[PDB]
Design a protein around this ligand. Structure first.
Ligand SMILES: O=C1Cc2ccccc2C(=O)N1O
Ligand SMILES: [Mn+2]
Ligand SMILES: [Mn+2]
Length: 180
């Protein structure tokens, strides 16, 4: 699985995933499922940010924590938007809300509720993707056009197929359950 990750995602994503794990005392070489998941989540965030008009989104995820908070503070102090308790993934300058992006190997609505009760915001938009083509967003407002969401869904299903073809998929699906 370690090698699958490094040949599946680009080096920039992999490098960012390693940092993220190390700061949490996780080892990519051992917790290889978490490594895949972080890479996947990062890839979706970047695809999502690319789905809008050029200036639309502030990317928060994949930054150093401290600079992530600084940027969040700047957005809040300048839009008047409520400061979130937890670091979100993006800020949408068009819709004027933060976005939390989730990617789950379980049902989309289960994950959606866990994420919603954790953040406790009537402001932060939530948008979940599955490895099966399902999506769920706050107030059925999916933010992006169909084309952009579809590309992401396709990519996720390719990742699943690539994993399955190597026999890594069961273990990767089970692992999110054994975590929760
Ligand atoms: O920043 C985080 C941290 C995290 C931790 C564990 C599971 C999902 C996430 C997640 O989706 N984001 O965005
Ligand atoms: Mn995040
Ligand atoms: Mn997220």
């Amino acid at each position: 699985m370690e090698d699958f990750v490094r040949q599946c995602f680009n080096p920039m994503i992999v490098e960012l995933a390693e940092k993220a794990m190390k700061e949490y005392g996780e080892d990519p070489k051992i917790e290889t499922n978490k490594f895949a998941a972080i890479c996947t989540h990062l890839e979706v965030c970047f695809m999502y940010s690319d789905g809008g008009s050029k200036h639309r989104f502030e990317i928060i995820e994949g930054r150093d924590r401290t600079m992530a908070w600084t940027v969040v503070n700047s957005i809040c102090n300048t839009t008047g938007v409520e400061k979130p308790k937890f670091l979100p993934d993006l800020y949408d300058y068009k819709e004027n809300r933060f976005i939390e992006i989730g990617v789950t190997r379980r049902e989309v609505h289960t994950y959606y509720l866990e994420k919603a009760n954790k953040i406790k915001s009537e402001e932060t938009h939530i948008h979940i993707f599955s490895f099966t083509g399902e999506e769920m967003a706050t107030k059925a407002d999916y933010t992006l056009d169909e084309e952009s969401r579809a590309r992401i869904k396709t990519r996720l299903f390719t990742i699943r197929q690539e994993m399955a073809s190597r026999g890594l998929w069961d273990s990767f699906r089970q692992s999110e359950r054994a975590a929760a």
